[PDB]
């Protein structure tokens, strides 16, 4: 199906405490493959998946070169932004950057993106057409204009439409054994009486990849959010994911309730039923 490559960058200022924290990580789909942390030992961009380890010194030296440039850019931006908003030196502020590309099932370019945030909120984004910017406020219009003047979108667009998808394909082919797999969720259902009149049913999805899943409870065929507790999808730590969904039901009515499961790895949507 569809694939993606994404880089996320966090820059956090440290009032009174010197240089800002800087962290960067690369993902293909829901799998981390590179990182650079400013507090780590190496001060290099480091592999995190086994299929990126086989790239040579030329790759590591260049990604290190470039992530240090990203780092220097955010170092500069924290101070510029502090001035744009006239914020005192006392507070920590956060900058975030995300960029990447989506390819479709034929591995050709579907979409490209680049967002930038300050203090947890949109600052500037490339629009869908990869050709212009959206600025949250008056200070971000300054940025918009600098980035227009220097024609940054054209050079970013080329990256997203070319370099970004060429390397994503490379990584998909190199790491085919782990990146081009769908693991069907392992489902089961648990039962916990509350009283003589009510009981909890919980529907479990385990060991699935990618993280995109849908777990909904139905009653007599009908949608059923009322009484449904639903945890956020979570990482198992072995590269697969987990989730659960619960409902509270009248005792002896358990067979009216079905749990439906939708996942990339499943030929047909599932339907489970607490049978006694």
């Amino acid at each position: 199906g569809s694939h993606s490559m994404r880089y996320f960058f966090t820059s956090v200022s440290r009032p009174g405490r010197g240089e800002p924290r800087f962290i960067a990580v690369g993902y293909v789909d829901d799998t981390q493959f590179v990182r650079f942390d400013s507090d780590a030992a190496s001060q290099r961009m480091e592999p995190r998946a086994p299929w990126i380890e086989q790239e040579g010194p030329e790759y590591w030296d260049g990604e290190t070169r470039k992530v240090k440039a990203h780092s220097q850019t955010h170092r500069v931006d924290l101070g510029t932004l502090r001035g744009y908003y006239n914020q005192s030196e006392a507070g920590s502020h956060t900058v975030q950057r995300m960029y990447g590309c989506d390819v479709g099932s034929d591995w050709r370019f579907l979409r490209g993106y680049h967002q930038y945030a300050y203090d947890g909120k949109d600052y500037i984004a490339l629009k869908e057409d990869l050709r212009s910017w959206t600025a949250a406020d008056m200070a971000a219009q300054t940025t918009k204009h600098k980035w227009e003047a220097a024609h940054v979108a054209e050079q970013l667009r080329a990256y997203l439409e070319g370099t970004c998808v060429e390397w994503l394909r490379r990584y998909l082919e190199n790491g085919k054994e782990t990146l081009q797999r769908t693991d069907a969720p392992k489902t089961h259902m648990t039962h916990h009486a509350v009283s003589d009149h009510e009981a909890t049913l919980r529907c479990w999805a385990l060991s699935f990849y990618p993280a995109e899943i849908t777990l909904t409870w139905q009653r007599d065929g009908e949608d059923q959010t009322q009484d449904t507790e639903l945890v956020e999808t979570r990482p198992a730590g072995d590269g697969t994911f987990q989730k659960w969904a619960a409902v509270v039901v009248p005792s002896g009515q358990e067979q009216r309730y079905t749990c439906h499961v939708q996942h990339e790895g499943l030929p047909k949507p599932l339907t489970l039923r607490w049978e006694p």
């Binding site: 990604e63 470039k66 992530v67 440039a69 510029t80």
Partner: peptide
């Protein structure tokens, strides 16, 4: 692969 063109705000 990372992008080589980030520019300051």
């Amino acid at each position: 692969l990372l992008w080589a063109g980030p520019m300051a705000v």
